[PDB]
Antibody, heavy 222, light 213 residues
């Protein structure tokens, strides 16, 4: 019956502010402390802040102290996280979590129930097509690729030889850089004997910018 | 500050243990250690609290214990749906709460495979664009959990590293990618760079040099 619903997440520019909320039901909200926990994409859980049942005690992680404030409005069964001076390092899914302990100002845990989270992505970037660079064969089987760099937003899709080449192809998940732009790589393994004869071209589609790029990948000058 | 193994694996039906190593301020100072299970694309769920208690509805094959500054979660009779990320957590002296680094638990469902590593130096076209990315592509490994370390010459490098979390390939083995972003000056100012990938307690290292091809 316990349910927790976060909201208020979205795209925000660095330095700006944003206010997350977490609505609670199925238990006496008035009797329990509440935590905020965040998780950067593909990373570990990071505890953010805690507040006691009546808001008398609040504590913060060092990474957010001074910039984030936690509060609650017991009349609306809602927990809030006020985020200020946002940086790219704050990009994460933000979870609210109920503390197990009944009416106490000690907040030692455990985290009892979790919401499903709200995504906050802090980026100053606008719609931008990608730059594509070759990953040429050098050092039989050979790995070739093209590096799809500095685009926004997701997604980018990649094919090889206009789709004719499928065996051995893997396109990796994107990476989010400091600058707020995405990058990825697509790879394919080839017989080395074909490198001198067969043409290899990766086809990069970025519909959000209405940009298609075909990049020829040739062997390196040594 | 709580240290967990990056990867723990076992065959179906077997018993595994995940260690959580903290300090006299964390795991050693209080009996407030918890364990959380997180399946892909979902929210954590409490498995064990106060070192060794189980919420009702949590299978009794999960068990928690503590000794000194090290807490331990034990999963008996491994089942495929036990495959998830596991995090320990504890109250600290700093009147905060901290999570462990996290452990991917793999229930072995295919043969183990050591990673194949290919390291790409920056392309001439990228350097002419006044950028330099080293691309370390890790493929054909199982279980799908690696840790990547970078070296410039022989000393480690932590600034500018980005690593994807492993996902399955066409051949249903795992692949991951790691990037070292540096300036073209940085690239030429060193003798060699190395990508080291640790997998199942063993490390494979590949090295590129600006003067080779």
């Amino acid at each position: 019956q316990v349910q927790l619903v976060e909201s208020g997440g979205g795209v925000v520019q660095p330095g700006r502010s944003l206010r997350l909320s977490c609505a609670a039901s199925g238990f006496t909200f008035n009797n329990y402390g509440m935590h905020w926990v965040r998780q950067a994409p593909g990373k570990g859980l990071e505890w953010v802040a805690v507040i006691s049942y009546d808001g008398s005690n609040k504590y913060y992680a060092d990474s957010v102290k001074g910039r984030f404030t936690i509060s609650r409005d017991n009349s609306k069964n809602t927990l809030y996280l006020q985020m200020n001076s946002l940086r790219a390092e704050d990009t994460a899914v933000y979870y609210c979590a109920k503390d197990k302990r009944f009416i106490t100002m000690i907040l030692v845990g455990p985290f009892d129930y979790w919401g499903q989270g709200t995504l906050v992505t802090v980026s100053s970037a606008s719609t931008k097509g990608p730059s594509v660079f070759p990953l040429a064969p050098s050092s039989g089987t050979a790995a070739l690729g093209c590096l799809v760099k500095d685009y926004f937003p997701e997604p980018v899709t990649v094919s090889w030889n206009s789709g004719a080449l499928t065996s051995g192809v893997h396109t990796f998940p994107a990476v989010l850089q400091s600058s707020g732009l995405y990058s990825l790589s697509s790879v394919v393994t080839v017989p080395s004997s074909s490198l001198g004869t067969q043409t290899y071209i990766c086809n990069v589609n970025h519909k959000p910018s209405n940009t298609k790029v075909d990049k020829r990948v040739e062997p390196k000058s040594c | 500050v709580l240290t967990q193994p990056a990867s723990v694996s076992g065959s179906p039906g077997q018993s595994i243990t995940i260690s959580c190593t903290g300090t006299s301020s964390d795991v050693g100072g209080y009996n407030y250690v918890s364990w959380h299970q997180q399946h892909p694309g979902k929210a954590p769920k409490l498995m064990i609290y106060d070192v060794s208690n189980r919420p009702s509805g949590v299978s009794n094959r999960f068990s928690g214990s503590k000794s000194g500054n090290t807490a331990s979660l034990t999963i008996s009779g491994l089942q495929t749906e036990d495959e998830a990320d596991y995090y320990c957590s504890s109250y600290t002296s700093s009147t905060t709460n901290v999570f462990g680094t996290g452990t991917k638990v793999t229930v072995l469902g295919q043969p183990k495979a050591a990673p194949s590593v290919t390291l790409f130096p920056p392309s001439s076209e990228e350097l002419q664009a006044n950028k330099a990315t080293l691309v370390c592509l890790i493929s054909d490994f199982y279980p799908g959990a690696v840790t990547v370390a970078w070296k410039a010459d022989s000393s480690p490098v932590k600034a500018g590293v980005e690593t994807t979390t492993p996902s399955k390939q066409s051949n249903n083995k795992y692949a991951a990618s790691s990037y070292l972003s540096l300036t073209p000056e940085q690239w030429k100012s060193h003798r060699s760079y190395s990508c080291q990938v640790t997998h199942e307690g063993s490390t494979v290292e590949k090295t590129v040099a600006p003067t080779e091809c």
